[PDB]
């Protein structure tokens, strides 16, 4: 089965996991994903592209689910962990963005364990 199409059930699970991550709010009602939806342009933040080898945003992850680029829930996981890794690489330790990216890793893993195990 190594090369085979993604079942509709799997694609639905992928979208539900990523929607849980994108929609996640703190107790104040702030949506943590907001800044991570779209990458900055190379004109507005050139130094991002000098430091980050493999840029990714949540828009691109949603596109990759739709175009069947993830072979597995593990491949989806790897791209979400890459996004969060890039945020921690570029942004200052202790910054809101840096901290938010750590919480989103946990939100992803919780959603995967709950949705795929139920
Ligand atoms: O790691 C990121 N740091 C950042 N971003 C990101 C956007 C998507 C994915 C990631 Cl993983 C990041 C990101 C995105 C923006 C967008 C650009 C288009 N207009 C909406 C805002 C602006 C600034 C950023 C930072 C955070 C703040 C400091 C500069 C860079
Ligand atoms: Zn399709």
From Swiss-Prot:
Q: Which residues bind Zn(2+)?
A: 68, 85
Regions annotated as coiled coil: none
Span of the signal peptide: none
Name its cellular compartments: Nucleus
In this UniProt entry, the residues modified to Phosphoserine are: 4
What does the record say about PTM? During apoptosis, cleaved by cathepsin CTSG to produce a 160 kDa cleavage product which localizes to the cytosol. Ubiquitinated.
Domain Bromo, first and last residues per copy: 5-115
Q: What's the disease link here?
A: Nicolaides-Baraitser syndrome: A rare disorder characterized by severe intellectual disability with absent or limited speech, seizures, short stature, sparse hair, typical facial characteristics, brachydactyly, prominent finger joints and broad distal phalanges. Some of the features are progressive with time. Blepharophimosis-impaired intellectual development syndrome: An autosomal dominant congenital syndrome characterized by blepharophimosis, facial dysmorphism, global development delay, delayed motor skills, impaired intellectual development with poor or absent speech, and behavioral abnormalities in some patients. Additional variable features include distal skeletal anomalies, feeding difficulties with poor growth, respiratory infections, and hypotonia with peripheral spasticity.
Family of this protein = Belongs to the SNF2/RAD54 helicase family.
The record describes its quaternary structure and partners as:
Component of the multiprotein chromatin-remodeling complexes SWI/SNF: SWI/SNF-A (BAF), SWI/SNF-B (PBAF) and related complexes. The canonical complex contains a catalytic subunit (either SMARCA4/BRG1/BAF190A or SMARCA2/BRM/BAF190B, mutually exclusive) and at least SMARCE1, ACTL6A/BAF53, SMARCC1/BAF155, SMARCC2/BAF170, and SMARCB1/SNF5/BAF47. Other subunits specific to each of the complexes may also be present permitting several possible combinations developmentally and tissue specific.
Say what the protein does: ATPase involved in transcriptional activation and repression of select genes by chromatin remodeling (alteration of DNA-nucleosome topology). Component of SWI/SNF chromatin remodeling complexes that carry out key enzymatic activities, changing chromatin structure by altering DNA-histone contacts within a nucleosome in an ATP-dependent manner. Binds DNA non-specifically. Belongs to the neural progenitors-specific chromatin remodeling complex (npBAF complex) and the neuron-specific chromatin remodeling complex (nBAF complex).
Entry protein name: SWI/SNF-related matrix-associated actin-dependent regulator of chromatin subfamily A member 2
Q: Which organism is it from?
A: Homo sapiens (Human)
Give the source lineage, highest ranks first.
Answer: Eukaryota, Metazoa, Chordata, Craniata, Vertebrata
């Amino acid at each position: 089965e190594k090369l085979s199409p993604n079942p509709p059930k799997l694609t639905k699970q992928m979208n539900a996991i990523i929607d849980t991550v994108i929609n996640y709010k703190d107790s104040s009602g702030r949506q943590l994903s907001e800044v991570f939806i779209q990458l900055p342009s190379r004109k507005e933040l050139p130094e991002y592209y000098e430091l980050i080898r493999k840029p990714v945003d949540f828009k691109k992850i949603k596109e990759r689910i739709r175009n069947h680029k993830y072979r597995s829930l593990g491949d989806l996981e790897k791209d979400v962990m890459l996004l969060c890794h890039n945020a921690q690489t570029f942004n200052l330790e202790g910054s809101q963005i840096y901290e938010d990216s750590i919480v989103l890793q946990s939100v992803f893993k919780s959603a995967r364990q709950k949705i795929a195990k139920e």
